[PDB]
Amino acid sequence: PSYLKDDDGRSLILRGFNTASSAKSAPDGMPQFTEADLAREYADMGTNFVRFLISWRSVEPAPGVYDQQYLDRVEDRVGWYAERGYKVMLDMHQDVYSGAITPGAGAIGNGAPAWATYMDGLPVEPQPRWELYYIQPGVMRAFDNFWNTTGKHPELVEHYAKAWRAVADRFADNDAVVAYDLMNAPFGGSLQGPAFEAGPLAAMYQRTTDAIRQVDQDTWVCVAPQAIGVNQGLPSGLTKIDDPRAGQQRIAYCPHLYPGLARTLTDVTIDAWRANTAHTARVLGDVPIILGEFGLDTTLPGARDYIERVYGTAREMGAGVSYWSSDPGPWGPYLPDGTQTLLVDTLNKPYPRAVAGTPTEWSSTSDRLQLTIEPDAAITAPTEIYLPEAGFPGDVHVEGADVVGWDRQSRLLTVRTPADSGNVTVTVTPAA
Template identity: 25%
Template sequence: MVRARWIFVLMLLGFAVTVPQPAFAAASGFTDPYGRELTFRGFNVSGSTKLHESGLLPFRSTADAAASATAMREQTGANAIRFLISWEGVQPAATTIDTAYLSRAAAQIRQFTDRGIHVLLDYHQDLYSSYVFNTGSWYTGDGAPKWVIAKGSYPTESCGICVLWGQNMLTNNAVRKPAYDFWHNTYGVQDAYLAQAMSALTYLGTALPRDMLLGVDPFNEPFDGGLDGASGTTWEQTYLLPFYQRFRAVMDTAGWSALPLYAEPLVFWNTTFGEAGGLSTIPALGGRYVFNSHYYDGARITVDPTAAGDGTYSSAMNRIRDRAVTLGTTGFVSEFGNAMSNSRTPWMVRAMYQGLDSRLSGANFWNNAAGSGPVLSATQWQWDVYSGRHSELMNGNPSKVQTTGDAWNGEDHSVIASGALRLDRRVLDRLYPSAVAGHTLAFAYEDLARDGFAGAGTQKAWLTVPSRLTTIAALVAARQYGVLVWRDTGITAPTELHLPGSFAPARTTVVSDLGTRTGLPSTGTIAAGPETGATTAQRLLLTASGATSGTVHVALIINTSDTTTVPAATLTAARTELLTWASGITW
């Protein structure tokens, strides 16, 4: 029904339409049937998949999934989720594929696709399995079912002095040995994994709308379990890449050949403390794969006491962009974020989004916009509607009932709890170019988010306009705003940007080579309309009808809710200034 409404709206606006097909990955990015460049933004749903109390799914009911999808779409403008499923959930016994589990998963997924939210399916594991831990352990895991662990003879679980749960991957042999067996296909365990994936993908492929699926992440955060004296890059070549190739063949046979495989490097790559793989020595993957990285600030999680600020994560996000280019494919950041218990988290997350938007810091953008680079698609960790309201028996121990935070290894990352956003909405509900009719040359956004939780704290602008652009600087001062530059490629469908909830269409100003407007109508060259599947969430539509292919377009989008009007003379002067700025750059 959502797809039909979307097609009908485009027809009313005069666009030729075709039935949408899946978004493809290529070196130039995700595209839709019109050839528009797509950006996906959203959240992981959710860490509840790690919990037996939730039936190893993100939601306890389809109704909870529906309410969550609605809230996410309306409050953040998300157009994508990474939906977690569990090997244990799919295959609880060696000879059993639990189609009831898959049916529940499909019903939950459809609540998101029905609301215009695309889905990346994620086979999730952390520390390989909960069944390698004892009932009194400090930690737990998720992923492999009990019957898999029973195949091996593994040491008693002990992490030693582990401050963080992730250290289990490095020092806990009860975790490392079964992972080692997986990659070496001991006991045929990898064969069994691929066989159940074939069954699951075949089932889900018939139960889900293909045009709303992004692909499959076949193994969350792969860790080696033992390098046999080799390097991380050698391990990736010898074990990880062949696994991905085998899973790629499973996807093709199960009917998912049109969708990419999201290939993650070794888990500790790009974590501040050193290179550990990164798929840096394997052949180019090409467009049937996506380079799928996570990013967490290992230093600020552990030893770095400083706050994040303008440009803090430019380097980390640019490494992901550059690695994707080297691999001949698209980059995607399927996890990023930080604990809600950390007072520095609001601006850490803000700075991560800034790094996803552009290669440049805010201080450098206006003077060096040609180096802005592609916008990265991403899903933040995480969106758990049960945050702080869990009742999970850790490792099945009734004396260790986990209720707080994520109820898993002491984490507390959910951006929502009890129906309310925990971070400043301005961090999460962002202007971003969801579909660009051409090639994106530059994008940046000033969210004016505060450094405290739920909108408290200090406000500071990072995207600063040079003083030589007098009118633009005055127009955007103390206001949220974004700027998009793109090269026309002859596409007739509009360029679309998600409008944050703070950008009421009637009080939004657009300055562009396409014209100027304060107050956005529902039709025309510069217009606004509802996001697909949403009631209140809005999108900006910019239509460059009749433009010559190769033309460089530019749009400045400003939240002018603090004023009833912007003088026409100001708009004219700002347009002249903006076009002069754009024409003076070699794109």
């Protein structure tokens, strides 16, 4: 398994949230999420990652005209993350194309600006569940116009690529920004399956990557498969994307996961998903994997077991994870009054954040972490590990490594391992 790396070459294990679905409808493009809310998230779970929702309608409110005041706002929020040691993936988010699909901000449909939305007078009648808007004639049309399946709008993917370039231009020298997730939940309209993914989807990813690389050579470009089918464990037809940057490719794979009998189904679905994800990660060039979206109603029986099974699969796969989502509700870490859900204790586990070498295997319980590293002598920065206070209330006991520092406030343990002695196993336990 492959990993994104920080500037010191350490391999990243990414744990965080999607922040946030409230941005979809916000006039100013921002989530209802404050610097205090991040401090709570950090205090409670020690997260080191966010998938941060941005929008094309906010980037490019008119054709060819980028809103630098919106990018200022995004940059302000990234600043919060940066100050608490987070890595940031920016997600160009849409669902159901645009808020402009009924009488581009919106709570349901969201993403593209009005000027880029061409339903051509075709209906979008109300539906019992929101996902059904996808197949309504005007939405199918909005998408066919975007991918130029109609031949009527070749300019749209060109505007899209250059709106992404405007964003990368602002963030190219931001040390907190590590990834650009190019399109949330790609939907092909009248095109589905590999003819979509190998077709206009890949062709957009290529143009967009290329445009981003005019102004940002180092940020990882993350690509997703088509959402329908692949979310549920079907194989993707996505083809390799070329990274024009000098040296090694920086493309990662950013799939979603949305699966007595109901349990067995869910179990084989995760197995199917892992095998399919691992395949496409190989096709794209043995790329790092980020599980960009997964979540559920935490109040449903069997929820924690499912969450834990997903996170263990992510761990085994070397994947990053951004949970859907930080918004208040029974899916998130906190109910609206601020009360913790079962997710908080479930997620609040020790984990290596930045490893001085390749993590080959690791495990953690609430009062033990074990990690095996494949050495790298060119790395001088220490291995950095998060330890929760419940399980590690004082000092640490470390075997297989020397303690460089133990910050009991930030909860970051830094250790140094031998690089000239093969694979190293570090074990961390609370001091007697």
